[PDB]
Design a protein around this ligand. Structure first.
Ligand SMILES: [Cs+]
Lengths: 91, 459
């Protein structure tokens, strides 16, 4: 019964790849999943995944300048998910 | 091509409450050291051929020029105050305090090579020489620039809520002044060498405010990782090689006002002798309370670099205005009492004796350059001072001197009372920074869009 990993920031890319520098005030039980898609609808979503207060992470940003959208995922108390949050700003 | 300096004004919301008032007590402790200074200019007057500064404002050559490098960390350590470890901000705060003694032993070794003013090509106050008890201020005071670099590395780790240097560098001066005269001639004391020994005495208190550092791993959690300050990790270990190009660009750009020392001191001795050398009871009143000015931003230059790690992207660079313009309030509302007032009968015969019977063709640049620069490098103390951007900020300055080459031979070739007339394209050299820079402070607080890549969050 709650809301998201509730900060948003991507400072720079390495405009192949990209940094994703977001909230993590401790964890909870602790866990993060992080979506991995464009906003294209095609090129399936994939998955990165992290631990501690570690959504403060970074991508394999394979493909070029194209619009990319990606979310991260609380995990806590119930081995399930305590809410997600995304922005979408690319290369 | 009307404004390629984009969305100018806006550095405003309700910022009336940007309170970097303890970033002025970063330079009210700097009146505190700027001011032993003369109490041995006029302390070594006991000795009359103690004109003694004869090195001391041509030693503060490889002080303030290596200084730049060192006061070039203020980012490094403010910026990682939105990280966590003052001890990897301090493994730097050491690796530099290595520097702050490594370059400090060049301060201390290049000073050696120094001492051959036994040389000539033009007029007095730049060649002559029979009696030099300067010989030794050149060393009893040029041996310090080692312990004097760590003793600036010091406030380059005042960047995070203390001005416990205003604490020490005030009890510093006062311990020096007593001690200053002990050598000029003194007590039990080594009581002899005085024309030099004001300087052995001053440099005495460097070494003492070098451990006004040591004495402040004291009131809270550490900044002491002075384990072996060594380096190697590649061909040459950075966090060191890193300070490098926050270094070269700083000093070599403190090497504007370093030729503004072979400009302002190469226009007194054409046939212009008299009140053209009293263009310095003037321009040392630039220095004087240009410092507390200027250096609000070389004190502010924290609350900007500090607040880039503390991930507030232009919640700093649009306080890089609200402090740009706040002593800029007094940048102009006391360029008022600058072109206004003069050396009256409050000026007896102190820092460079010449008070009763000369001209005011001296307050004629107390406006020229005065507020149209005041701030225009308190820009850089938030450019550099914020970012990388001294890289060629450097070449900020390759103009404010090369733009001011010909407003050199532009008093000597003049239309009127052109005393302030080589302060021509050197007050116009010197407000093509009202552009060049605060040009990159809106390429630049417009990189804290590009950088701030998500605009806010949820609840
Ligand atoms: Cs200056």
């Amino acid at each position: 019964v709650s809301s998201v990993p509730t900060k948003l920031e991507v400072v720079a890319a390495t405009p192949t790849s990209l940094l994703i520098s977001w909230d993590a005030r401790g964890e909870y039980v602790v866990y993060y999943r992080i979506t991995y898609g464009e906003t294209g609808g095609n090129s399936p979503v994939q998955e990165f995944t992290v631990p501690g207060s570690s959504s403060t992470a970074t991508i394999s940003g394979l493909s070029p300048g194209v619009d990319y959208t990606i979310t991260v995922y609380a995990r806590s108390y119930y081995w399930g998910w305590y809410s997600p949050i995304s922005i979408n700003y690319r290369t | 091509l009307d404004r390629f300096s984009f969305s100018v004004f806006l550095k405003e919301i309700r910022l009336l409450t940007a309170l970097a008032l303890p970033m002025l007590l970063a330079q009210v402790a700097q009146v505190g050291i700027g001011f032993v200074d003369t109490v041995m200019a006029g302390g070594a007057g006991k000795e009359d051929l103690a004109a003694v500064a004869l090195g001391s404002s041509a030693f503060a050559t490889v002080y303030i020029t290596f200084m730049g490098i060192m006061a070039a960390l203020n980012p490094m350590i403010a910026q990682l105050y939105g990280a966590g470890k003052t001890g990897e901000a301090g493994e730097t705060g050491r690796q530099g305090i290595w520097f702050g003694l490594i370059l400090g032993i060049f301060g201390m070794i290049l000073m050696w090579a120094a001492i051959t003013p036994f040389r000539n090509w033009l007029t007095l106050s730049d060649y002559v020489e029979g009696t030099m008890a300067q010989y030794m201020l050149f060393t009893s005071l040029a041996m310090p620039a080692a312990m004097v670099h760590r003793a600036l590395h010091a406030y380059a780790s005042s960047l995070n809520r203390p001005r416990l240097i205003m604490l020490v560098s005030f009890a510093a001066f006062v311990l020096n002044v007593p001690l200053n005269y002990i050598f000029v001639y003194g007590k039990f004391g080594m009581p002899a060498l005085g024309g030099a020994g004001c300087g052995v005495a001053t440099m005495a208190v460097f070494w003492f405010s070098a451990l006004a550092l040591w004495i402040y791993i004291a009131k809270e959690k550490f900044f002491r990782p002075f384990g072996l300050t060594a380096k190697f990790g590649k061909p040459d270990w950075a966090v060191f090689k890193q300070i490098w190009k926050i270094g070269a660009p700083i000093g070599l750009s403190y090497f504007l006002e370093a030729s503004a020392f072979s400009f302002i001191v190469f226009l007194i001795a054409p046939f212009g002798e008299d009140y053209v050398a009293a263009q310095q009871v003037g321009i040392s009143l630039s220095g004087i309370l240009y410092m507390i000015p200027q250096s609000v931003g070389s004190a502010g230059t924290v609350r900007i670099g500090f607040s880039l790690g503390r991930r507030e992207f232009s919640r700093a660079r649009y306080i890089s205005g609200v402090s740009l313009v706040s002593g800029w309030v007094l940048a102009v509302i006391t360029v008022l009492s600058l072109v206004l007032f003069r050396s009256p009968l409050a000026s007896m015969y102190n820092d460079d004796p010449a008070v009763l019977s000369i001209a005011s063709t001296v307050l004629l640049f107390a406006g020229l350059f005065q507020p149209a620069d005041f701030t225009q490098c308190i820009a850089s103390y938030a450019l550099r001072g914020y970012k990388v951007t001294k890289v060629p900020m450097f070449i900020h300055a390759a103009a404010f001197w090369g733009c001011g080459l010909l407003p050199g031979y532009l008093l000597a070739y003049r239309f009127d009372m052109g005393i302030y007339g080589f302060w021509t394209a050197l007050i116009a050299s010197l407000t093509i920074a009202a552009v060049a820079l605060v040009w990159c402070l809106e390429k630049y607080s417009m990189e804290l869009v590009k950088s701030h890549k998500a605009v806010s969050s949820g609840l």
